[PDB]
């Protein structure tokens, strides 16, 4: 059968056990003798990425929101985001009362096309959110150059690329702030979870306050007594409670340990598949940027020519492969419809949002981003747990697609 | 039982461990994970909480604060709206309102319940007002008879903030079931906790579906829960309303299911002890316990509150009173402390510092800091809150607190 995801061991279980033995289940819970799982996780992930500051939080969505809040973003601002991504990239912007402004993606990476960014920049633009989508990385060299020239911040959405390396720098480390999801499907997971990283110490403080009802850590854990609060008032910036449970921080500490190993396994299997699948006619694989030395695969993506597969759309191509391979819709599916065409994206439906950002239904749906729209219609996405199988088991994917090619010659 | 130590919080057992194991056995850690043959912990917990509360619909979420925020969104509250809240509460009650681009409007609390004073609500009502958020604070309930009458007369919604009152009963209805939507926190210090978490409940079927969508990126569960395969998504697109991800992890939903098992009985222990304290403490001259309305047949005590007259206690404030008591009982600060400052005076409340909030609602430091609610203001200076863990001790342990308070009265007689 196909690999399950997530994967736990007894180390997972021990880490939970430590939480129960601590009797501290939240960071807003008082000190009970030793450091919290949150801070231990924050340190370990920050060292994993060679970045100095990390603040855990509740989700990838909330991580983006906090990041935007920390950069002073608000009413009247525009934030540039890719047309092809999971809707959270966009709705995070809406959630801080800014307008997301879409830009199409490159055909070979499905990451935001730096050559189209300039043309979307306006007086209101304050930031860009590139997404390291599926199993690639947005072009951070070009994107940082554009941002530096137009005075814009850069928030990396690393939800699908935990541990990717671009010119010796881990994903999330290269813009001003890096945002991560630890939702079940992701390569680093506790069911739900969020992470922020940054090199900037001012941002570190503001992000703590944003996620802890305006509080920061105390100056020195080492002088806390049993019963004392570790979180203390600051009030430089208003926050709400987006604190990660100690149970989740503990599982992340466990899961982190096997991250680089499992990423290399995935990456090598992506390679196998590129080699295999590219030999089939009318199957295109993604192009790896030179700058990337280590690529994390959350989803492995290839493209098909509908002219050589009997006019199949990817919904149908995927329904066939799922029946032929005996794997479900979590494991195999087309990319997200681009955000403006995605029924889950519907800001006009809620009053919270400003009149000026919710536009109308026709407004948003009538937008056009042809690379993104094509990609959704003629690409197949394989969930990364499949990149943890035996290469002999992967050859079943290759043959299933070789059989489909053969049939529709 | 002789005294050895004050009870601590939280409290687990091996049933808690087994609930975590079941999550591992399931191989489903998020409600956004693939179907593995049985319903989520989320759903199991929702159904359990629904039954406990006598309420048709239940949707877990991530925190009390998000529960409040999502309840507001689900009632269509947004820019240009006002929402009435009490001055005396935790700041999340107000900041959840600012989060949806509405203006929180403070009303003072009643002297002998510290819950929103219904007689002051009419005066704060304007054309912008769309809802009231009563808080069932510490170990009282807001007056839902009066609040619902005012709400009906003025076409306002009512969201009950139940974070400090899980299981309280007003005229044979559980707290959270009486207004349009109930919101709950399951943060560590609460009586029902998984360290973090939240709950939303409603009677209204349309609100149930909206709330589902508001917490799972505009998704609901697929219709036929048992006509999908292992490895399939169970959340399907719906898109009636724009949502975000405010899904509770299966590990937390699992913990809550275990904890909920014991909730009613641990609440009864607390309440039996609160009554004993009210008996004992009300006999000390200068001490005033809170008044419990006859509509309340079960009161959940997140905190036991009593008041003191500084005139009869040497001019001490609450902070000093608490410090003495903690010294003499060897009790920690988490368990015995004055109540909250009023929200408008709380330093953690500083919405003007945040550009994300609309200029029109964040206003200025001068605006918020310069408000005045006397009853609520005096609360922190002359009240003592006992965290509910201490109420799981034996009655003879609690008598030690009574004697400490009585001794201190004697000194100043
Ligand atoms: C680029 C990007 N940015 C932000 C996010 C949001 O993070 P979370 O709030 O942790 O979900 C995601 C997660 N996206 C996933 C996508 C998946 N199809 C869905 O079923 C799942 O619930 C969600 O976690 C992402 O992929
Ligand atoms: C009355 C009240 N409302 C809302 C909240 C917010 O709950 P959470 O901390 O889980 O966001 C709390 C938490 O302390 C609370 O006491
Ligand atoms: Cl989608």
PDB file of N, CA and C in Angstrom, chain B residues 85-133:
ATOM      1  N   UNK B  85     -20.345  45.609  24.933  1.00  0.00           N
ATOM      2  CA  UNK B  85     -19.638  44.662  25.801  1.00  0.00           C
ATOM      3  C   UNK B  85     -19.448  45.246  27.218  1.00  0.00           C
ATOM      4  N   UNK B  86     -19.221  44.365  28.202  1.00  0.00           N
ATOM      5  CA  UNK B  86     -18.979  44.903  29.536  1.00  0.00           C
ATOM      6  C   UNK B  86     -17.566  45.430  29.645  1.00  0.00           C
ATOM      7  N   UNK B  87     -17.380  46.447  30.487  1.00  0.00           N
ATOM      8  CA  UNK B  87     -16.021  46.965  30.749  1.00  0.00           C
ATOM      9  C   UNK B  87     -15.167  46.019  31.475  1.00  0.00           C
ATOM     10  N   UNK B  88     -15.757  45.184  32.311  1.00  0.00           N
ATOM     11  CA  UNK B  88     -14.988  44.293  33.129  1.00  0.00           C
ATOM     12  C   UNK B  88     -15.072  42.889  32.560  1.00  0.00           C
ATOM     13  N   UNK B  89     -13.965  42.511  31.931  1.00  0.00           N
ATOM     14  CA  UNK B  89     -13.783  41.232  31.315  1.00  0.00           C
ATOM     15  C   UNK B  89     -12.357  41.185  30.845  1.00  0.00           C
ATOM     16  N   UNK B  90     -11.988  40.040  30.276  1.00  0.00           N
ATOM     17  CA  UNK B  90     -10.696  39.885  29.642  1.00  0.00           C
ATOM     18  C   UNK B  90     -10.763  40.635  28.332  1.00  0.00           C
ATOM     19  N   UNK B  91      -9.610  41.113  27.859  1.00  0.00           N
ATOM     20  CA  UNK B  91      -9.582  42.014  26.712  1.00  0.00           C
ATOM     21  C   UNK B  91     -10.096  41.412  25.419  1.00  0.00           C
ATOM     22  N   UNK B  92      -9.960  40.093  25.255  1.00  0.00           N
ATOM     23  CA  UNK B  92     -10.479  39.409  24.056  1.00  0.00           C
ATOM     24  C   UNK B  92     -11.970  39.653  23.744  1.00  0.00           C
ATOM     25  N   UNK B  93     -12.765  39.943  24.752  1.00  0.00           N
ATOM     26  CA  UNK B  93     -14.148  40.205  24.523  1.00  0.00           C
ATOM     27  C   UNK B  93     -14.319  41.460  23.628  1.00  0.00           C
ATOM     28  N   UNK B  94     -13.457  42.455  23.815  1.00  0.00           N
ATOM     29  CA  UNK B  94     -13.478  43.688  23.039  1.00  0.00           C
ATOM     30  C   UNK B  94     -12.676  43.586  21.760  1.00  0.00           C
ATOM     31  N   UNK B  95     -11.506  42.964  21.819  1.00  0.00           N
ATOM     32  CA  UNK B  95     -10.603  42.903  20.675  1.00  0.00           C
ATOM     33  C   UNK B  95     -11.108  42.025  19.572  1.00  0.00           C
ATOM     34  N   UNK B  96     -11.956  41.060  19.927  1.00  0.00           N
ATOM     35  CA  UNK B  96     -12.646  40.241  18.912  1.00  0.00           C
ATOM     36  C   UNK B  96     -13.581  41.098  18.025  1.00  0.00           C
ATOM     37  N   UNK B  97     -14.138  42.181  18.603  1.00  0.00           N
ATOM     38  CA  UNK B  97     -15.013  43.078  17.934  1.00  0.00           C
ATOM     39  C   UNK B  97     -14.203  43.959  16.949  1.00  0.00           C
ATOM     40  N   UNK B  98     -13.120  44.551  17.451  1.00  0.00           N
ATOM     41  CA  UNK B  98     -12.176  45.295  16.601  1.00  0.00           C
ATOM     42  C   UNK B  98     -11.637  44.426  15.439  1.00  0.00           C
ATOM     43  N   UNK B  99     -11.448  43.151  15.724  1.00  0.00           N
ATOM     44  CA  UNK B  99     -11.003  42.193  14.681  1.00  0.00           C
ATOM     45  C   UNK B  99     -11.932  42.079  13.478  1.00  0.00           C
ATOM     46  N   UNK B 100     -13.235  42.222  13.696  1.00  0.00           N
ATOM     47  CA  UNK B 100     -14.135  42.222  12.558  1.00  0.00           C
ATOM     48  C   UNK B 100     -14.477  43.630  12.048  1.00  0.00           C
ATOM     49  N   UNK B 101     -13.677  44.629  12.427  1.00  0.00           N
ATOM     50  CA  UNK B 101     -13.846  46.010  11.980  1.00  0.00           C
ATOM     51  C   UNK B 101     -15.044  46.732  12.582  1.00  0.00           C
ATOM     52  N   UNK B 102     -15.544  46.206  13.697  1.00  0.00           N
ATOM     53  CA  UNK B 102     -16.614  46.885  14.431  1.00  0.00           C
ATOM     54  C   UNK B 102     -16.029  47.612  15.661  1.00  0.00           C
ATOM     55  N   UNK B 103     -16.835  48.495  16.282  1.00  0.00           N
ATOM     56  CA  UNK B 103     -16.434  49.261  17.485  1.00  0.00           C
ATOM     57  C   UNK B 103     -17.037  48.629  18.715  1.00  0.00           C
ATOM     58  N   UNK B 104     -16.179  48.179  19.644  1.00  0.00           N
ATOM     59  CA  UNK B 104     -16.729  47.765  20.941  1.00  0.00           C
ATOM     60  C   UNK B 104     -17.175  49.017  21.746  1.00  0.00           C
ATOM     61  N   UNK B 105     -18.328  48.897  22.395  1.00  0.00           N
ATOM     62  CA  UNK B 105     -18.932  49.953  23.199  1.00  0.00           C
ATOM     63  C   UNK B 105     -19.151  49.354  24.583  1.00  0.00           C
ATOM     64  N   UNK B 106     -18.427  49.906  25.544  1.00  0.00           N
ATOM     65  CA  UNK B 106     -18.412  49.432  26.909  1.00  0.00           C
ATOM     66  C   UNK B 106     -19.606  49.888  27.706  1.00  0.00           C
ATOM     67  N   UNK B 107     -20.103  48.976  28.528  1.00  0.00           N
ATOM     68  CA  UNK B 107     -21.129  49.272  29.489  1.00  0.00           C
ATOM     69  C   UNK B 107     -20.637  48.721  30.814  1.00  0.00           C
ATOM     70  N   UNK B 108     -20.959  49.431  31.882  1.00  0.00           N
ATOM     71  CA  UNK B 108     -20.512  49.057  33.226  1.00  0.00           C
ATOM     72  C   UNK B 108     -21.179  47.773  33.685  1.00  0.00           C
ATOM     73  N   UNK B 109     -20.622  47.179  34.731  1.00  0.00           N
ATOM     74  CA  UNK B 109     -21.175  45.981  35.318  1.00  0.00           C
ATOM     75  C   UNK B 109     -21.930  46.246  36.614  1.00  0.00           C
ATOM     76  N   UNK B 110     -22.739  45.252  37.015  1.00  0.00           N
ATOM     77  CA  UNK B 110     -23.493  45.292  38.277  1.00  0.00           C
ATOM     78  C   UNK B 110     -22.566  45.040  39.449  1.00  0.00           C
ATOM     79  N   UNK B 111     -22.776  45.810  40.502  1.00  0.00           N
ATOM     80  CA  UNK B 111     -21.906  45.799  41.683  1.00  0.00           C
ATOM     81  C   UNK B 111     -21.804  44.413  42.339  1.00  0.00           C
ATOM     82  N   UNK B 112     -22.906  43.678  42.353  1.00  0.00           N
ATOM     83  CA  UNK B 112     -22.959  42.439  43.087  1.00  0.00           C
ATOM     84  C   UNK B 112     -22.928  41.194  42.211  1.00  0.00           C
ATOM     85  N   UNK B 113     -22.791  41.370  40.903  1.00  0.00           N
ATOM     86  CA  UNK B 113     -22.491  40.209  40.002  1.00  0.00           C
ATOM     87  C   UNK B 113     -21.272  40.345  39.107  1.00  0.00           C
ATOM     88  N   UNK B 114     -20.801  41.589  38.936  1.00  0.00           N
ATOM     89  CA  UNK B 114     -19.791  41.992  37.952  1.00  0.00           C
ATOM     90  C   UNK B 114     -20.093  41.565  36.516  1.00  0.00           C
ATOM     91  N   UNK B 115     -21.364  41.328  36.201  1.00  0.00           N
ATOM     92  CA  UNK B 115     -21.778  41.064  34.841  1.00  0.00           C
ATOM     93  C   UNK B 115     -22.465  42.330  34.309  1.00  0.00           C
ATOM     94  N   UNK B 116     -22.483  42.438  32.991  1.00  0.00           N
ATOM     95  CA  UNK B 116     -23.016  43.618  32.333  1.00  0.00           C
ATOM     96  C   UNK B 116     -24.366  44.045  32.901  1.00  0.00           C
ATOM     97  N   UNK B 117     -24.477  45.329  33.230  1.00  0.00           N
ATOM     98  CA  UNK B 117     -25.672  45.865  33.853  1.00  0.00           C
ATOM     99  C   UNK B 117     -26.752  46.114  32.812  1.00  0.00           C
ATOM    100  N   UNK B 118     -27.787  45.271  32.811  1.00  0.00           N
ATOM    101  CA  UNK B 118     -28.779  45.435  31.749  1.00  0.00           C
ATOM    102  C   UNK B 118     -29.422  46.817  31.733  1.00  0.00           C
ATOM    103  N   UNK B 119     -29.531  47.464  32.911  1.00  0.00           N
ATOM    104  CA  UNK B 119     -30.132  48.792  33.037  1.00  0.00           C
ATOM    105  C   UNK B 119     -29.312  49.857  32.403  1.00  0.00           C
ATOM    106  N   UNK B 120     -28.056  49.568  32.060  1.00  0.00           N
ATOM    107  CA  UNK B 120     -27.203  50.499  31.380  1.00  0.00           C
ATOM    108  C   UNK B 120     -27.053  50.207  29.902  1.00  0.00           C
ATOM    109  N   UNK B 121     -27.665  49.135  29.392  1.00  0.00           N
ATOM    110  CA  UNK B 121     -27.469  48.770  27.991  1.00  0.00           C
ATOM    111  C   UNK B 121     -28.234  49.661  27.004  1.00  0.00           C
ATOM    112  N   UNK B 122     -29.492  49.985  27.335  1.00  0.00           N
ATOM    113  CA  UNK B 122     -30.361  50.848  26.514  1.00  0.00           C
ATOM    114  C   UNK B 122     -29.690  52.142  26.193  1.00  0.00           C
ATOM    115  N   UNK B 123     -29.085  52.782  27.182  1.00  0.00           N
ATOM    116  CA  UNK B 123     -28.406  54.045  26.942  1.00  0.00           C
ATOM    117  C   UNK B 123     -27.254  53.953  25.975  1.00  0.00           C
ATOM    118  N   UNK B 124     -26.552  52.828  25.886  1.00  0.00           N
ATOM    119  CA  UNK B 124     -25.451  52.702  24.931  1.00  0.00           C
ATOM    120  C   UNK B 124     -25.880  52.301  23.523  1.00  0.00           C
ATOM    121  N   UNK B 125     -27.160  52.085  23.297  1.00  0.00           N
ATOM    122  CA  UNK B 125     -27.637  51.593  22.013  1.00  0.00           C
ATOM    123  C   UNK B 125     -27.704  52.762  21.059  1.00  0.00           C
ATOM    124  N   UNK B 126     -27.106  52.622  19.877  1.00  0.00           N
ATOM    125  CA  UNK B 126     -27.206  53.651  18.811  1.00  0.00           C
ATOM    126  C   UNK B 126     -27.741  52.969  17.547  1.00  0.00           C
ATOM    127  N   UNK B 127     -27.793  53.674  16.424  1.00  0.00           N
ATOM    128  CA  UNK B 127     -28.222  53.074  15.151  1.00  0.00           C
ATOM    129  C   UNK B 127     -27.225  52.070  14.613  1.00  0.00           C
ATOM    130  N   UNK B 128     -25.982  52.189  15.020  1.00  0.00           N
ATOM    131  CA  UNK B 128     -24.963  51.264  14.611  1.00  0.00           C
ATOM    132  C   UNK B 128     -24.939  49.938  15.376  1.00  0.00           C
ATOM    133  N   UNK B 129     -25.642  49.864  16.500  1.00  0.00           N
ATOM    134  CA  UNK B 129     -25.567  48.710  17.338  1.00  0.00           C
ATOM    135  C   UNK B 129     -26.248  47.517  16.683  1.00  0.00           C
ATOM    136  N   UNK B 130     -25.522  46.393  16.612  1.00  0.00           N
ATOM    137  CA  UNK B 130     -26.040  45.121  16.080  1.00  0.00           C
ATOM    138  C   UNK B 130     -26.023  43.956  17.052  1.00  0.00           C
ATOM    139  N   UNK B 131     -25.242  44.039  18.129  1.00  0.00           N
ATOM    140  CA  UNK B 131     -25.192  42.938  19.085  1.00  0.00           C
ATOM    141  C   UNK B 131     -24.713  43.348  20.478  1.00  0.00           C
ATOM    142  N   UNK B 132     -24.999  42.496  21.440  1.00  0.00           N
ATOM    143  CA  UNK B 132     -24.455  42.572  22.790  1.00  0.00           C
ATOM    144  C   UNK B 132     -23.682  41.256  23.075  1.00  0.00           C
ATOM    145  N   UNK B 133     -22.540  41.389  23.730  1.00  0.00           N
ATOM    146  CA  UNK B 133     -21.763  40.242  24.189  1.00  0.00           C
ATOM    147  C   UNK B 133     -21.721  40.221  25.723  1.00  0.00           C
TER     148      UNK B 133
END
